[PDB]
Amino acid sequence: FDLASLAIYSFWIFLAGLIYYLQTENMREGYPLENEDGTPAANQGPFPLPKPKTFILPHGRGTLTVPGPESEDRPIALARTAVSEGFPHAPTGDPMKDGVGPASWVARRDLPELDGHGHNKIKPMKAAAGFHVSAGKNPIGLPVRGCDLEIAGKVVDIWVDIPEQMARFLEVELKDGSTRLLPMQMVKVQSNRVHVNALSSDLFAGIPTIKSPTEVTLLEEDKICGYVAGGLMYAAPKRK
Amino acid sequence: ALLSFERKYRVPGGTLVGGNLFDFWVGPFYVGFFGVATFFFAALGIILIAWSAVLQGTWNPQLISVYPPALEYGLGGAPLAKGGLWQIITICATGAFVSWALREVEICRKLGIGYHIPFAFAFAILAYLTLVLFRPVMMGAWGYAFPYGIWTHLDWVSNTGYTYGNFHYNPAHMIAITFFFTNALALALHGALVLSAANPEKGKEMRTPDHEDTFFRDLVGYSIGTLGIHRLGLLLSLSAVFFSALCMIITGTIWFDQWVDWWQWWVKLPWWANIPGGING
Amino acid sequence: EYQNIFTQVQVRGPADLGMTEDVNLANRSGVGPFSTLLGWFGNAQLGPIYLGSLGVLSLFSGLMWFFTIGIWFWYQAGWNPAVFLRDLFFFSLEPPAPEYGLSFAAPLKEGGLWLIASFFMFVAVWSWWGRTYLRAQALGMGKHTAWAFLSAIWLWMVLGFIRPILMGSWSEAVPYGIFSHLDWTNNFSLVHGNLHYNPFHGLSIAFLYGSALLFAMHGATILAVSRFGGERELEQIADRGTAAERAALFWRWTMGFNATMEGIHRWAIWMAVLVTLTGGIGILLSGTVVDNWYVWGQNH
Numbered sequence: 001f002d003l004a005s006l007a008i009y010s011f012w013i014f015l016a017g018l019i020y021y022l023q024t025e026n027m028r029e030g031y032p033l034e035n036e037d038g039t040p041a042a043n044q045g046p047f048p049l050p051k052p053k054t055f056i057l058p059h060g061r062g063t064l065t066v067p068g069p070e071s072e073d074r075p076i077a078l079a080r081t082a083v084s085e086g087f088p089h090a091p092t093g094d095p096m097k098d099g100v101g102p103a104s105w106v107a108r109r110d111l112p113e114l115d116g117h118g119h120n121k122i123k124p125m126k127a128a129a130g131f132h133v134s135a136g137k138n139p140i141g142l143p144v145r146g147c148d149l150e151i152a153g154k155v156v157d158i159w160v161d162i163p164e165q166m167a168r169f170l171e172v173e174l175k176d177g178s179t180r181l182l183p184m185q186m187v188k189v190q191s192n193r194v195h196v197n198a199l200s201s202d203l204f205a206g207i208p209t210i211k212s213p214t215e216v217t218l219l220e221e222d223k224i225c226g227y228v229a230g231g232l233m234y235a236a237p238k239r240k
Numbered sequence: 241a242l243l244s245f246e247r248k249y250r251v252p253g254g255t256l257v258g259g260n261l262f263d264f265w266v267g268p269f270y271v272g273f274f275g276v277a278t279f280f281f282a283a284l285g286i287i288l289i290a291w292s293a294v295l296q297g298t299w300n301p302q303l304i305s306v307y308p309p310a311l312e313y314g315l316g317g318a319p320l321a322k323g324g325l326w327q328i329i330t331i332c333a334t335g336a337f338v339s340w341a342l343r344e345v346e347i348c349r350k351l352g353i354g355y356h357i358p359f360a361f362a363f364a365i366l367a368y369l370t371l372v373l374f375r376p377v378m379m380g381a382w383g384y385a386f387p388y389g390i391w392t393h394l395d396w397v398s399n400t401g402y403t404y405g406n407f408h409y410n411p412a413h414m415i416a417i418t419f420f421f422t423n424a425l426a427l428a429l430h431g432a433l434v435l436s437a438a439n440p441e442k443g444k445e446m447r448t449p450d451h452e453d454t455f456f457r458d459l460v461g462y463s464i465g466t467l468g469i470h471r472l473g474l475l476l477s478l479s480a481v482f483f484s485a486l487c488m489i490i491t492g493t494i495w496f497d498q499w500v501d502w503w504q505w506w507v508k509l510p511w512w513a514n515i516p517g518g519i520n521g
Numbered sequence: 522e523y524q525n526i527f528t529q530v531q532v533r534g535p536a537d538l539g540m541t542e543d544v545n546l547a548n549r550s551g552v553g554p555f556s557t558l559l560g561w562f563g564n565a566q567l568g569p570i571y572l573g574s575l576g577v578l579s580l581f582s583g584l585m586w587f588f589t590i591g592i593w594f595w596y597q598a599g600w601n602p603a604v605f606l607r608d609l610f611f612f613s614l615e616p617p618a619p620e621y622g623l624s625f626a627a628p629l630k631e632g633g634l635w636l637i638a639s640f641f642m643f644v645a646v647w648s649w650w651g652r653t654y655l656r657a658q659a660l661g662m663g664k665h666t667a668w669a670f671l672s673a674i675w676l677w678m679v680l681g682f683i684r685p686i687l688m689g690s691w692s693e694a695v696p697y698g699i700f701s702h703l704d705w706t707n708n709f710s711l712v713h714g715n716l717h718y719n720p721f722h723g724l725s726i727a728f729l730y731g732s733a734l735l736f737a738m739h740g741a742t743i744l745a746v747s748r749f750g751g752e753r754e755l756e757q758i759a760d761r762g763t764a765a766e767r768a769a770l771f772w773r774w775t776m777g778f779n780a781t782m783e784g785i786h787r788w789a790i791w792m793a794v795l796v797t798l799t800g801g802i803g804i805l806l807s808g809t810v811v812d813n814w815y816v817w818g819q820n821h
């Protein structure tokens with residue numbers, strides 16, 4: 001029972017407690033577990049639910065307490081394919097429009113994210129005094145091409161994360177005059193075009209629109225990004 | 241059982257093999273074809289480990305050790321008890337590791353996310369194959385690989401390193417260590433920075449990412465950014481493992497002496513090679 | 522199929538002077554130049570930097586530590602610049618010999634100078650520690666950074682200060698030299714019976730490997746959901762989006778459990794601090810309590 005033996009035994013005890021604490025802290029979202037019908041599941045595991053904590057959100061946006069009564073706060077157009085649990089749920093309609101699967105979006109607050117001063121974090125570059133393209137290819141003016149090698153529109157602006165100084169969306173003007181936002185992480189700026197492999201030229205119009213030409217809400221961002229990523233699975237039939 | 245938000249994501253599709261045949265979950269785990277493969281290799285490898293323990297004569301996990309074939313066997317097969325079990329278990333381990341990676345890819349596709357995770361995991365797989373496959377083959381014998389034992393495989397590291405003096409002087413080994421240390425340094429700072437902003441002083445509102453940026457400009461005059469730090473961490477950890485496999489694939493293959501002798505090209509440059517004084521003068 | 526490792530189109534705007542909170546704006550520098558080079562991988566903006574009394578003290582004290590080692594190296598080189606560059610990595614400023622015990626009366630060339638350098642290094646590191654605390658405090662942030670830094674200081678304090686004192690000799694400290702401190706590390710293991718059989722050394726390694734494991738996981742995870750704006754982690758904590766949901770579900774489906782956007786950073790901060798926390802323990806017990814970790818190991 002020398003001091004080294006006690007030190008290492010103590011540490012293993014301390015580490016077990018640490019793991020228990022880390023795991024409970026990681027159960028503040030998505031718990032308690034549900035059955036596939038939404039009811040609470042009988043087996044929740046050995047770790048209990050953590051006790052509620054409160055974040056005070058800045059800019060008077062209220063407070064968040066987690067854990068708390070969870071809610072999708074939106075309809076889910078899916079149906080069971082098996083009486084037993086563990087099987088996929090199939091879309092009942094159009095999954096890209098119904099926002100399910102890889103096209104899923106979360107009902108976030110219908111407000112724009114704000115920077116440390118209370119201003120919109122993301123703005124079109126035409127409304128961002130001083131911002132410009134400093135390196136790489138400037139996509140403004142370039143044609144936008146879909147996975148069907150057809151042109152859907154042209155880039156008319158860039159929406160910028162001002163605190164980070166980072167391009168986050170391309171604003172693309174469609175053949176009908178309207179515009180849509182395209183995540184920067186899903187496009188491929190080339191010399192003579194912008195290529196989007198996730199969508200076909202005739203699926204750009206289906207991207208969710210924003211209600212203000214100079215700001216985008218967190219809900220709008222989730223609908224836009226989810227739709228585009230969903231195209232990888234759901235637009236593949238016409239992908240050359 | 242599901243998470244409260246999970247159902248909408250549990251749609252069919254995204255597989256690479258078998259269509260909808262293995263497109264289902266067992267509890268939280270997604271199966272898929274490569275989930276079945278992973279189970280098959282893993283179960284078969286574990287049986288052979290238990291079998292090697294019976295041949296060895298112990299069930300104490302601290303003593304079990306599956307050794308590769310003796311050097312005299314070269315690169316040919318060996319009998320089960322004389323290194324064959326190591327050979328088969330190495331195949332099973334490779335099969336499981338690769339199956340695991342391709343399962344992750346199937347999951348990336350069903351979730352419509354990027355493939356960065358299985359791509360990063362492949363670097364760890366590469367380091368494993370560097371030590372059990374690439375380097376043994378280039379040296380001409382499976383025996384140069386390391387044994388599968390909790391403690392015997394530490395002895396292997398110690399024996400292999402001291403065959404070349406102090407392995408510290410392996411220049412690629414230094415670089416790999418630098419990325420390992422820097423990575424843990426970056427991981428600690430990143431975790432602390434987010435927590436410091438999400439959990440500010442008492443009587444304070446949650447901070448913003450601008451605060452995170454300002455904190456680091458104040459501290460060291462530069463902030464890499466929320467996206468940049470995740471690029472960086474991925475980079476530091478993969479570079480660490482890349483130069484690990486590099487510092488071993490060259491040991492015993494193109495370099496055979498003590499690694500301290502490698503630094504002589506600097507010391508013995510014929511112009512200052514004789515200037516008296518200093519350490520080497 | 523864009524991967525988001527390097528920025529495709531850099532954008533630049535009016536420099537960000539940063540949050541104010543209770544920072545003393547007198548001690549902030551001006552803004553430095555933008556770096557297109559860094560813009561490909563991260564933010565291009567350099568500066569401003571905060572420079573208070575602790576920063577200045579840490580800076581000056583750290584440079585004195587540096588210059589002390591420097592002149593000793595020029596002295597070992599016989600003041601010859603050619604010899605200096607050749608043997609740069611072989612030079613070493615070593616602590617006093619065991620004869621001097623914990624005395625400060627070692628002549629400069631027999632450990633006296635190592636003691637002066639260590640003093641400066643001691644002031645520089647600890648004043649820098651106070652700097653990480655007050656910078657967070659001035660902005661109203663938690664002190665997680667200062668506490669994580671303590672874990673690194675712990676191992677450094679053990680290696681150069683706490684253990685040598687418990688051993689009763691400054692000669693047990695580490696020398697200042699590129700190669701010489703590698704050699705010190707090798708002898709430390711041989712003397713104490715193979716550190717591979719020190720349990721806290723093995724733990725320290727599990728967390729070092731685990732830090733690379735976890736950061737590859739988290740970095741790769743965030744880039745894979747950056748198409749949903751996943752890197753904006755503070756707002757995902759306040760308002761879970763589809764980025765946090767897909768990231769959690771990937772790992773739940775892969776290995777059976779998952780983290781939250783906030784909780785993954787508690788895994789990370791602990792994975793990393795446990796490296797130097799366990800390691801400093803293992804070094805402190807070596808020679809003070811246990812002489813031969815292999816032999817000690819065979820009894821447990």
Ligand code: BCL
Binds near residue numbers: 396
């Ligand atoms: C006396 C011993 C020698 C020495 C000899 C060696 C030798 C010999 C080697 C190293 C290697 C390494 N050494 Mg050295 N080294 C010494 C001193 C040091 C010191 C130090 C402070 O003194 C440091 C920091 C290091 C650092 C390192 C790393 C750069 C590297 C190990 C990481 C690696 O390759 O990961 C790579 C990661 C892996 C191999 C993991 C792969 C995992 C696989 C894909 C998945 C496994 C799944 C698992 C079975 C599933 C379990 C499932 C359950 C659910 C849990 N060495 C001394 C001088 N060192 C090694 C190296 O570079 O290897 C390539 C190596 O072989």
Ligand code: BCL
Binds near residue numbers: 289371393394723
């Ligand atoms: C990397 C360069 C060297 C090497 C050098 C060292 C040194 C030096 C040390 C270890 C240590 C360990 N090594 Mg080793 N090790 C290597 C290759 C491996 C491989 C492999 C398949 O390639 C595996 C699975 C292991 C496994 C292990 C663990 C027993 C232990 C802690 C690792 C850890 O937490 O990592 C980080 C990963 C995590 C935190 C995630 C969780 C991983 C868990 C812990 C893996 C358990 C694997 C299990 C014991 C074996 C398979 C079980 C099957 C059911 C049969 N090593 C190569 C040959 N390894 C340390 C120790 O104490 O050993 C006794 C130690 O000091």
Ligand code: BCL
Binds near residue numbers: 707708709717797801
């Ligand atoms: C022959 C060599 C021995 C051995 C001897 C030792 C010794 C001796 C030590 C280690 C230690 C460690 N070894 Mg070992 N090690 C061996 C084999 C291995 C192997 C392997 C593959 O076999 C591996 C992976 C490791 C890995 C490790 C790490 C887990 C651990 C270092 C933690 C760390 O982050 O330190 C890096 C962090 C620090 C040094 C803290 C520094 C913080 C300070 C405050 C910062 C100074 C800043 C300064 C001012 C510089 C300014 C720079 C600015 C840019 C200006 N060793 C063999 C058996 N090892 C350490 C440990 O804890 O062991 C239990 C240790 O002391």
Ligand SMILES: CC[C@H]1c2cc3[nH]c4c(c3C)C(=O)[C@H](C(=O)OC)c4c3nc(cc4[nH]c(cc(n2)[C@@H]1C)c(C(C)=O)c4C)[C@@H](C)[C@@H]3CCC(=O)OC/C=C(\C)CCC[C@H](C)CCC[C@H](C)CCCC(C)C
Binds near residue numbers: 282388
């Ligand atoms: C490349 C950067 C770092 C990294 C990254 C990394 N690892 C990863 C991933 C990533 C990104 C995953 O996505 C994947 C994962 O899901 O992690 C949770 C994984 C993973 N990294 C793991 C381990 C691991 N990674 C390590 C290292 C690293 N991983 C690097 C430092 C290490 C060490 C030693 O440092 C270990 C031990 C696993 C937890 C997991 C992969 C699990 C897997 O492949 O599961 C399928 C296999 C089984 C279920 C069991 C197979 C059993 C065998 C058939 C028999 C055993 C044979 C074996 C050779 C015995 C060896 C024992 C002795 C050596 C003691």
Ligand SMILES: COC1=C(OC)C(=O)C(C/C=C(\C)CC/C=C(\C)CC/C=C(\C)CC/C=C(\C)CC/C=C(\C)CC/C=C(\C)CCC=C(C)C)=C(C)C1=O
Binds near residue numbers: 274278735779788
């Ligand atoms: C920001 O976003 C993120 C998340 O969401 C918000 C996360 O959740 C995570 C995951 C990280 C954690 C949960 C932290 C803890 C992990 C650690 C310490 C790594 C080390 C992990 C382990 C030790 C666990 C290893 C476990 C396994 C390998 C699973 C064991 C395997 C089994 C049981 C078999 C697999 C099953 C099958 C093949 C299917 C069944 C087969 C049949 C034939 C039916 C990351 C990275 C992240 O950035």
Ligand SMILES: COC(C)(C)C(=O)C/C=C(\C)CC/C=C(\C)CC/C=C(\C)CCCC/C(C)=C/CC[C@H](C)CC/C=C(\C)CCC=C(C)C
Binds near residue numbers: 587641642698
């Ligand atoms: C052009 O050249 C000039 C001359 C200008 C130069 O500047 C050249 C200079 C260099 C190239 C510098 C080279 C630098 C190095 C080689 C540094 C290498 C450092 C290491 C390998 C790390 C060693 C650190 C480990 C130790 C032992 C640290 C000691 C820290 C202690 C915790 C402090 C202990 C304090 C003591 C003993 C007493 C002081 C006072 C107290 C109150 C404690």
Ligand SMILES: CCCCCCCC/C=C\CCCCCCCC(=O)OC[C@H](O)CO
Binds near residue numbers: 461463465
């Ligand atoms: C480049 C010119 C100036 C010199 C720089 C000083 C040297 C710093 C060395 C190592 C630490 C690496 C820092 C990386 C850790 C950052 C932690 C983090 O999360 O940062 C994200 C972002 O900054 C928040 O918004």
Ligand SMILES: CCCCCCCCCCCC[N+](C)(C)[O-]
Binds near residue numbers: 006010011014
């Ligand atoms: C007889 C006891 C000997 C000391 C054992 C050390 C184990 C505990 C280590 C964790 C220290 C707690 N801390 C500071 C990280 O919160």
Ligand SMILES: CCCCCCCCCCCC[N+](C)(C)[O-]
Binds near residue numbers: 013014015018
């Ligand atoms: C030394 C025996 C310790 C037994 C239990 C230890 C549990 C500690 C876990 C760390 C909790 C982290 N926390 C709450 C301090 O932030």
Ligand SMILES: CCCCCCCCCCCC[N+](C)(C)[O-]
Binds near residue numbers: 019023045777778
């Ligand atoms: C490397 C240490 C890993 C520790 C893992 C412990 C956490 C496992 C939690 C599983 C139970 C969670 N579940 C299934 C109820 O959601």
Ligand SMILES: CCCCCCCCCCCC[N+](C)(C)[O-]
Binds near residue numbers: 315316327328331373
């Ligand atoms: C999944 C196949 C990949 C091959 C990697 C496995 C290598 C194991 C060592 C080879 C043993 C076979 N044999 C009989 C030729 O020695």
Ligand SMILES: CCCCCCCCCCCC[N+](C)(C)[O-]
Binds near residue numbers: 338341355
């Ligand atoms: C050595 C094992 C290899 C298996 C893991 C490889 C996964 C790489 C990820 C796929 C890349 C596909 N993409 C998106 C680049 O077209």
Ligand SMILES: CCCCCCCCCCCC[N+](C)(C)[O-]
Binds near residue numbers: 439440441665794
């Ligand atoms: C010795 C290393 C200690 C581990 C550090 C873990 C961070 C948890 C401490 C939270 C800090 C809380 N507070 C009030 C200072 O902001």
Ligand SMILES: CCCCCCCCCCCC[N+](C)(C)[O-]
Binds near residue numbers: 791
């Ligand atoms: C914060 C997560 C911690 C994960 C725990 C890792 C445990 C690795 C076990 C290593 C065994 C070391 N030992 C005691 C045998 O020398």
Ligand SMILES: CCCCCCCCCCCC[N+](C)(C)[O-]
Binds near residue numbers: 045267268776777778
């Ligand atoms: C030594 C590391 C151990 C890691 C083991 C983690 C197991 C995965 C989590 C199991 C949760 C699933 N289940 C069925 C219990 O609810």
Ligand SMILES: [Cl-]
Binds near residue numbers: 572575576577652
């Ligand atoms: Cl300051």
